Amino acid sequence: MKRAVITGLGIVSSIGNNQQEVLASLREGRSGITFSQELKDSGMRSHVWGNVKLDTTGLIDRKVVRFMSDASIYAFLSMEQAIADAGLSPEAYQNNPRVGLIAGSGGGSPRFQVFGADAMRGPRGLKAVGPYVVTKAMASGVSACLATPFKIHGVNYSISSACATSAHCIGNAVEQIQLGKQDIVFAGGGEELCWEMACEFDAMGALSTKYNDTPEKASRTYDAHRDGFVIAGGGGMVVVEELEHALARGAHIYAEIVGYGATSDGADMVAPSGEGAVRCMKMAMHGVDTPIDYLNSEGTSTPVGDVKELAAIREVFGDKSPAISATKAMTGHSLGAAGVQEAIYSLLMLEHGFIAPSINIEELDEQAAGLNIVTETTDRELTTVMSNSFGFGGTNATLVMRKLK
Amino acid sequence: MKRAVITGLGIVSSIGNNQQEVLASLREGRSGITFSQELKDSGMRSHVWGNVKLDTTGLIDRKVVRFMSDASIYAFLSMEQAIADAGLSPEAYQNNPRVGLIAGSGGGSPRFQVFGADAMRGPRGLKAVGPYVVTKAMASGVSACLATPFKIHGVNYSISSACATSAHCIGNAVEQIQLGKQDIVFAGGGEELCWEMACEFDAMGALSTKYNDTPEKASRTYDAHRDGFVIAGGGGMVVVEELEHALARGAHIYAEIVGYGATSDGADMVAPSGEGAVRCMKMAMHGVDTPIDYLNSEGTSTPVGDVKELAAIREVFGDKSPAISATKAMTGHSLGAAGVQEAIYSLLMLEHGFIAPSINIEELDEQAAGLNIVTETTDRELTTVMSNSFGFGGTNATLVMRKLK
Ligand SMILES: [N+]
Ligand SMILES: [N+]
C-alpha cells in the first residue's frame, strides 16, 4: 500500500544549528539550556529556555523573510538543510503537483500577535501594524511561509496538535504517500521562543522554576526532583518519500516509517491519561515484526506527565522494555517542533548506531521500576526506533522508524 | 476503497444558530452582517462584521468552558448539534478508538494571546494571567477543547490552512475513513471575532471599508464595486462516517463526499495564483462521473481573488459552467470556520433542492460576463455540488458532495 522512507533531514535547535552540531551534542550529552534575561525580565518564575544560538540575519532573502515569524524562519532554514541533505534540486521538487509540504507550529506567533495589538493600540494604528502581520500571526504561518518560496505545488497545510504538532505532520505526510497522492512531502515544523508565550505556561505552573541557577540541570526528566519542563524554540524538517521513487533516484535513505500512531485520551485537558499513550504506541507497533531497540520518549520533565508515560511504557512492553532516554533533559521542549526534532534525534541515533543519554537524573523515579533507562551515551546497533509525542487536549502521536532491508 | 458520507451537521454562524435558522437565511438571501462599534473604537477603517448573534454564557459546563476560547465555543456547540442530528448516542461515539475528531481554526485566539501579554505586563503579573490561557491561545484549541469533553479516543488534532482550514479538516477525515483507520470523524472548525485579529486584516487592506454606513451591502462578491471581505466568526461541524457504518445503523445520510482536492500555488503569499485553484478542482473532480450542478465559490469579495477564482472556474468547466453563488456575500468570511460552514450551506442546498442567491450584485464585474451566477433563490433538483476554499500561503481545498440513491 506504498511505503514511506526519510531521504533527508534538516534541523535548528538549542543543541545544534544542523545535524552535525546536533549529533555532537547528543553524543557528549550537551545541554542546550541557558539562563534567559528576557524571561526573568518579563517577570516570570522560570528563567531558563533552550534558545537557538544562531544569528539568522541575512540567511533569508528580504522579500521572503518579511512575511515570517521565528517559527517560519526556524522551519525554513531546516527545509533548506533537508533539501540539500536529500540531494534534491529545484527541477525535481518545484512546481511539481506530486510534492507537498505539511508543517506547523504549536502556537502560531504570540509575539507578532501581541505586536499587532500593541501597535494597533498606539497613535499610528494600522500604519504601525503594517501589512505583514497576518502571515506571521496565523496558525498556518509555518506551512504558508515555506510552500510559497519553495514553489510547492502538492498538499499545503499545517497540522496543529500542541506538543505533538510536528509528529502528526510527519504521520500525515506518510498517509499522503500511502494513499498514492504524493511522491514527496516535506514534513515537520517550528516554534518561536518568547516571553509572550512562555509566560502562559509559567502561569499554569508547567515550567521548572527551582533551577534558575543551574540551567543545564533544570530539565531533569525522570528525576525525583523534576519540577516542570524548560521551554524551547527551534525548527525541523524531514523529507518523507515514496520508496520506489527514492530507490529510483539513488537517494540516501535513513529509515522507513513502518509505524504511525495517532490517538486521543478523551480525559484531561492538560495532563496525559496514559490509557491513550498505550493504545497510540500499540497502533504504531502494529505490523512491525522487529522489536523496538530504542525509544525516544516524550519525557517532558514534569511530575505527572513523566510518571504517566512510564506506566504506559511498562504497560506496552513490561519487562522486555527497550532502551529509553528523554532527549528533552538536554534540549528542552520545543513544543510544536519537539515532534520532528525528536524524530531526527531518533534517526541520527539509528544512523550512527548510538543512544543518547538521559541526563540530569540524580535520583531515578520509583515509577521507572523495570525500564531500560539509558543514562550514558551507549554505542549500539539500532534497527527499529520509536518516538512518543503527547500534547494538551490529550492528543497523542507515535512514530516507528526502521532501517531499510 | 472505503466510501465516506455526511450523516449529521451542526452550525453557529452570522446567519443562524442551527441548520433551520441558516436554511431560512439562505432561502431568503438574508445578510448576517452588522455594524461593529468594537471595530470602530479599535481604530480600524472596516466597521462591519459577520457576528454570531448568541450569548453563549452557560451553554457549556463551566468546568469545560474555562479552557475554551470563542473559536472552541462555536465549534463545540456545532458538534453537540451534529451529534444529535446524526442520531449518535454517547456510547456510540464516546471512548471509541474508531471515532475521531479533526477540526481547527485559522488563528487560534489572538484575543487571549494578547490577554496573557497585557496581564503579564500589569501589577498582577502571572497571577492575572491564569492557568487557562494556554489551551485558549494555542493553534489546536479547537480540537483539544472538544476531543477531551466528548471523550474522543480516535484521531485528535487540528489542521490550519488559513481560509481553507475546516475544508482541509473535512478532506482529512475522509482520508482517515478511506484508509480504514476510523468509522466516524467529526470534522469542522471555529473562529473567534475580535478586533485583535481583525485589525491585522485591515492593516493589510483586505477588509471592506467603504460601506460602513450600509453594513449588509459591504460584502458584494462579483460586484464591480467590491472592496474587500467582511470578517466573521462562528463555527461548524459535520459527521464524516464510513458508508457501511452509516447504512448499517440506519443513519440519515446527507451526501457522499465523492471528491476532495488539496493543492498549493507556490506563487504569492496573499494573492491566489488561480493555477493552483484550477488543479485543486480538477483533482476533486477526478473519478466523478456526474456533472456539478452548483458551485459554492470562495468569493471572498476581493478585487483580485474574485477575478482569479472566476478565471479558474472558466478553465475547469469551459462552456459547461455550473450554477454559481457566493454565500459569503451574505455571511462574511469566517476564515477558519468557512470551509465547514460553506459545505453545510451546500449540503442544505442539496438536501432541500435550492440555490441560495449571490446577493449584492448591483453591477456584474466584466470578468463574469459569461457565467451562470445565481442572484435570486432558485428551486432546483441538485445532485452533485462543489465548494471552493482558498487561503493565504497559496493553500487550496475543494469538496464535491453528491446525493446518494
Ligand atoms: N520523543
Ligand atoms: N465555498
UniProtKB/Swiss-Prot annotation, chains A, B:
| Listed SUPFAM superfamilies | Thiolase-like
Which pathway, per its entry? Lipid metabolism; fatty acid biosynthesis
User: What is the reaction catalyzed?
Assistant: a fatty acyl-[ACP] + malonyl-[ACP] + H(+) = a 3-oxoacyl-[ACP] + holo-[ACP] + CO2; (3Z)-decenoyl-[ACP] + malonyl-[ACP] + H(+) = 3-oxo-(5Z)-dodecenoyl-[ACP] + holo-[ACP] + CO2
| EC number, UniProt record | 2.3.1.41
Which residues carry out catalysis?
Answer: 163 (for beta-ketoacyl synthase activity), 298 (for beta-ketoacyl synthase activity), 333 (for beta-ketoacyl synthase activity)
Q: Which UniProt keywords apply?
A: Acyltransferase, Cytoplasm, Fatty acid biosynthesis, Fatty acid metabolism, Lipid biosynthesis, Lipid metabolism, Transferase
**Which intervals hold domain Ketosynthase family 3 (KS3)?**
1-403
- Cite a GO CC annotation: cytosol
* InterPro entries tied to this protein: Beta-ketoacyl_synthase, Ketoacyl_synth_AS, Ketoacyl_synth_C, Ketoacyl_synth_N, PKS_Beta-ketoAc_synthase_dom, Thiolase-like
Which GO biological process entries does UniProt record here?
fatty acid biosynthetic process
Q: Which Pfam families match?
A: ketoacyl-synt, Ketoacyl-synt_C
Give compartment(s).
Answer: Cytoplasm
Gene3D superfamilies xrefs: 3.40.47.10
GO MF entries: 3-oxoacyl-[acyl-carrier-protein] synthase activity
Q: What does this protein do?
A: Involved in the type II fatty acid elongation cycle. Catalyzes the elongation of a wide range of acyl-ACP by the addition of two carbons from malonyl-ACP to an acyl acceptor. Can also use unsaturated fatty acids. Catalyzes a key reaction in unsaturated fatty acid (UFA) synthesis, the elongation of the cis-3-decenoyl-ACP produced by FabA.
Q: Assembly state and interactors?
A: Homodimer.
| NCBIfam families associated with the record | PRK07967.1 (NF005935)
Q: Which family does it belong to?
A: Belongs to the thiolase-like superfamily. Beta-ketoacyl-ACP synthases family.
Q: What is this protein called?
A: 3-oxoacyl-[acyl-carrier-protein] synthase 1
